[PDB]
Amino acid sequence: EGVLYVGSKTKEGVVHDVTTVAQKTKEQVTNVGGAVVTGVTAVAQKTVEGAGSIAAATGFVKKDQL
Amino acid sequence: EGVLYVGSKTKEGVVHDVTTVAQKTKEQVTNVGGAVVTGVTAVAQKTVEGAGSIAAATGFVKKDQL
Amino acid sequence: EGVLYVGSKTKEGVVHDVTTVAQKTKEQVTNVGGAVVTGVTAVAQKTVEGAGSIAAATGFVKKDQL
């Protein structure tokens, strides 16, 4: 029982080529108690295991009341 | 029982070529207690396992009352 | 029982070529307690397993009252 890798090439959970070019003459960002994401975000993961778990949150406003 | 990889090339959960070009002369962003995502977001994952789990949330406003 | 990969090339859960060009002269974004997504979002996943789970939410406003 299990996994057997015999002479194998595996890419799992990969973000491996991202090219970005940005040209802005004038920019303004105003944020009051919130999430603002202007930049590049690259997240690679193989396994996440749990009850009520958040994985790879880029822009996230969690205001919960249980 | 299990998995056998004999001389195999596998790409699973991959985001591997993304090209972006952006040209803006003037920009403004105003955000009050919310999520605003202007940038590139690349998320690769193989496995997520759990009850009530969020995976790969880019713009997310969770205001829950259980 | 299980899986056998003998000399196989498999791409599963992949987002591997996305090209974007954007030209804006003037832009404004106003957001009050909500989700606004202007940028590129690429999400690749192989497996998600759970009761009441959200996978790959790009623009999401969850205001629940259980």
Residue C45 pairs with which residues in a beta bridge?
B45
Q: What is the largest CA-CA distance in chain B?
A: 59
C28–B27 C-beta distance less than 8 A: yes
Left, alpha or beta for A33 (phi > 0: left; psi -120 to 50: alpha)?
left
The C-alpha atoms of residue C52 and residue C35 are separated, in whole angstroms, by 21
Subunits in contact with chain A (3 or more CB pairs closer than 8 Å): B, C
The C-alpha atoms of residue A26 and residue A35 are separated, in whole angstroms, by 21
What's the sign of the alpha-carbon dihedral B12, A51, C51, B1?
A: positive
Is residue B55 within 8 Å of C48, Cβ to Cβ? yes
Resolution of this PDB entry, in A? Answer: 3.4
Which 20-39 residues of chain A touch chain C by CB within 8 A? 34, 37
For residue A15, give both structure tokens: 């973000």
Query: Solved how?
Result: cryo-EM
What's the sign of the alpha-carbon dihedral B13, A38, C35, A48?
A: positive
Is residue B38 within 8 Å of C27, Cβ to Cβ? no
- Name which of B3, B21, B20 is nearest B12 in CA terms: B3
The C-alpha atoms of residue C15 and residue C44 are separated, in whole angstroms, by 6
CA A61 to chain centre: 15
The C-alpha atoms of residue A10 and residue C53 are separated, in whole angstroms, by 27
Residue C60 pairs with which residues in a beta bridge?
B60
Residues of chain B neighbouring C40 (CB-CB closer than 8 A): 18, 20, 40-41
Residue B32 pairs with which residues in a beta bridge?
A32, C32
Question: CA of C21: which chain A residue's CA is closest?
Answer: A21
The C-alpha atoms of residue B41 and residue B18 are separated, in whole angstroms, by 10
For residue B56, give both structure tokens: 């790969």
Is residue B37 within 8 Å of A34, Cβ to Cβ? no
- Name which of B62, B38, B40 is nearest B52 in CA terms: B62
DSSP structure string for A12-56 = EEE---EEEEEEES-EEEEEESSEEE-S-EEEEEEEEE-TT-EES
The C-alpha atoms of residue C32 and residue B23 are separated, in whole angstroms, by 26
| Residue B43 identity (one-letter amino acid) | V
Going by the DSSP 8-state scheme, the letter that residue B39 receives in this structure is S
Is residue C62 within 8 Å of B61, Cβ to Cβ? yes
Chain C closest CA to B38's CA: distance in Å? 4
For residue B38, give both structure tokens: 């202007």
